[PDB]
Amino acid sequence: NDLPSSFTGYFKKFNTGRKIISQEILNLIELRMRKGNIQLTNSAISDALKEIDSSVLNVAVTGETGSGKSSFINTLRGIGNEEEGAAKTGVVEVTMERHPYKHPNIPNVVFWDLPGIGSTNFPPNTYLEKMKFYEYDFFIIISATRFKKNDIDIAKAISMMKKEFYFVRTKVDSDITNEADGKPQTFDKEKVLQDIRLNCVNTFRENGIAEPPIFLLSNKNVCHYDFPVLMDKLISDLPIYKRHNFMVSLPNITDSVIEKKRQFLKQRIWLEGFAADLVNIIPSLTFLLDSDLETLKKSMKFYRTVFGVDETSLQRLARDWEIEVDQVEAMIKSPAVFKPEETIQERLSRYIQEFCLANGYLLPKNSFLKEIFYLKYYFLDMVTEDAKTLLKEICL
Amino acid sequence: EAGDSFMRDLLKREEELIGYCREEALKEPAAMVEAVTATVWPQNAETTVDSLLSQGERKLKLVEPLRVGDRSVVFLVRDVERLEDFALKVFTMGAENSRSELERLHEATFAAARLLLPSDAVAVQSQPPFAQLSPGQDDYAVANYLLLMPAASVDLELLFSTLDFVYVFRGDEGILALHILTAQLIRLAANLQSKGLVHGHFTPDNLFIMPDGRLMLGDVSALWKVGTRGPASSVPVTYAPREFLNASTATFTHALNAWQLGLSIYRVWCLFLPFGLVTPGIKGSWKRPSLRVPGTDSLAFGSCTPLPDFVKTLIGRFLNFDRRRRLLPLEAMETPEFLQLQNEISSSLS
Ligand SMILES: Nc1nc2c(ncn2[C@@H]2O[C@H](COP(=O)(O)OP(=O)(O)O)[C@@H](O)[C@H]2O)c(=O)[nH]1
Ligand SMILES: Nc1ncnc2c1ncn2[C@@H]1O[C@H](COP(=O)(O)OP(=O)(O)O)[C@@H](O)[C@H]1O
Prior knowledge:
Chain A: This is Interferon-inducible GTPase 1. Chain A: It is an enzyme of class 3 (hydrolase). The complex is a heterodimer of chains A (396) and B (350). With 396 residues, chain A is of the alpha/beta class. Chain A is built from 17 helices and 6 strands. A 6-stranded mixed beta sheet of chain A has the order 2-3-1-4-5-6, with helices on both faces. The longest helix of chain A has 24 residues, at 371-394. The radius of gyration of chain A is 24 Å and the shape is globular. Chain B has 2 domains: 1-22 and 152-350, Transferase(Phosphotransferase), domain 1 (Orthogonal Bundle), CATH 1.10.510; 23-151, Phosphorylase Kinase, domain 1, CATH 3.30.200.20. In chain B, α7 packs antiparallel against α8 (309-318). The structure holds guanosine-5'-diphosphate and adenosine-5'-diphosphate.
């Protein structure tokens, strides 16, 4: 019933690991809110958001030539291997230098393609020094088809430094298809996967390394295998403040990933809503200035992009299902919102009534967010749903 | 015997996959296979032949093609009235002296007869032996000389290519198979050494796992008494150490088979040859034609399966470039590393 309590209470409704800010930051904002200094309250929220936005993620990817390093990097960036900006194979092996590849929509998420150690004349420890091991948030060893000595030497060296790495086994779809083709009378999809996995586990143990996190996946089909659990593990290993950026950058491959992005962005809306000042008028009796409408249109465009239902993303889907974009757009809701018989003003008014009927005003009696923020929540629900709708089609 | 039976059971386990890759290997040389098949079996599945030795007349029923070599096709055949299956090797004639070369091969083979020995040599009836066989097809002349032998379950070359396709040697069983093959290769080479014998072709395409799981070496015509001098060209260039690349004529030595043994053990764990040597049918292979061409003369294990140090050491010692300092197989079996190999195999088996 008091505003600072309502503010902090919103975050408690999210599970540990889904919080966008630390308890320390929450405590500071709550403290300033209680002391009634709005200016310091704003600056605390602003500082928190800036720390979140300016966080940089550096992801290293090492492994043999042709192990699927560039493919893995492209898949996480949501970029096709032949599209512009795609990481290309072979090149790092010639230069013998790491190359950075930025996420297209969240450029503070940076993937580094590292040359295979075998492409250098570096022993493992020297190789890690030269590749700047300690500068990465995640160090990922990519391996395909069969474990190589180089893969395990790098792992043993990292274990020797008492640091961490992830092991990603790519091209499992290939091993599955190949055993299916070669041994149909005895082929079992689940057994092949299990045996590849145990071979990975066993290889580490046999070589004196505590088993690292291990993920079997396919760069060709994100609809299956360990991509979702990989994401879970990576984000969990991050400090809270880096989570937002990494999370919003992730490929929209499961309902859980999509839902988790929604949860983070809902907290961002809450922070932004409080930073903007709460008001004492109900949002069904206010109107949108052009400056608000502009902010809304930019919000919708950011959301659609984050969730892969933006124009470009829809076009790509259209070519691949071999159809017109207007057929893809017609499957979902977000593309029509700011499109020409009910006016935009009537439409946004209707969204307010629908949202506030279903969810209330989120705040103690007689306090409200500015109308634009209920609209952002509404847009976020819509874009989230749109992404699940299209994912159902893709992953099938 | 313990290892033999394990290999036998593993072969049975991978039988369908080996069969698949065997058929896959025949697609590229399809025109050759079909033309040779049509020459030897111009009617239906049976062809009547006479033994060049004491074995009299036989009818050989074609079961299926098995393998293609540089100038040969090997078929699985059946002698129905004897109730016996055989591998049958048939030779194409490119050379003008293909005929005299085969006559020479015949004499050398049967004079000489762990070693895969021929069972018989036969000629299609009503046509002279060794001469080009009718009906002739223009792209592939076939000699009227057919070599009958026991059929291997798989040759190591095909095994390696199969593993490169899908690496079915996973877990402790696959790893154990690698250990057993390593030990079998060493004992095979050691056995030759003990008899003062040298083979010019101790190579994966001439190393055969038999249905009982035993590893055998083929082509008894290429066996030499140690110290014998012969054509250096008889050694496959990618399996020849430097001292076999510098002369028309070379002395056949235990050092040669130590080198070749090192190559084959390396391939067991790595699939490709070391030193960037071209290894047809394996993806990770570079293109170095032979050791006379400059390249990486250092022994690199980075792209191999993670092999144990005791294997690394043994390979390193067999692959000493100095022809006076290579570890010989008998000596290798007395090493602690070979002891360790044997104990890993013994512990894993029982
Ligand atoms: N089927 C399948 N192919 C893959 C996968 N990852 C990579 N590839 C293919 O393997 C080849 C090499 O991958 P690439 O990313 O270019 O290798 P790298 O950058 O050198 O490590 C390319 O043709 C890819 O399309 C996968 O998960 N599944
Ligand atoms: N008895 C056998 N059983 C199964 N495969 C064999 C047998 N003899 C030879 N082969 C295979 O047939 C192919 C050609 O054999 P060969 O004529 O000895 O070699 P090349 O023709 O390449 O000199 C090789 O892959 C070899 O492994």
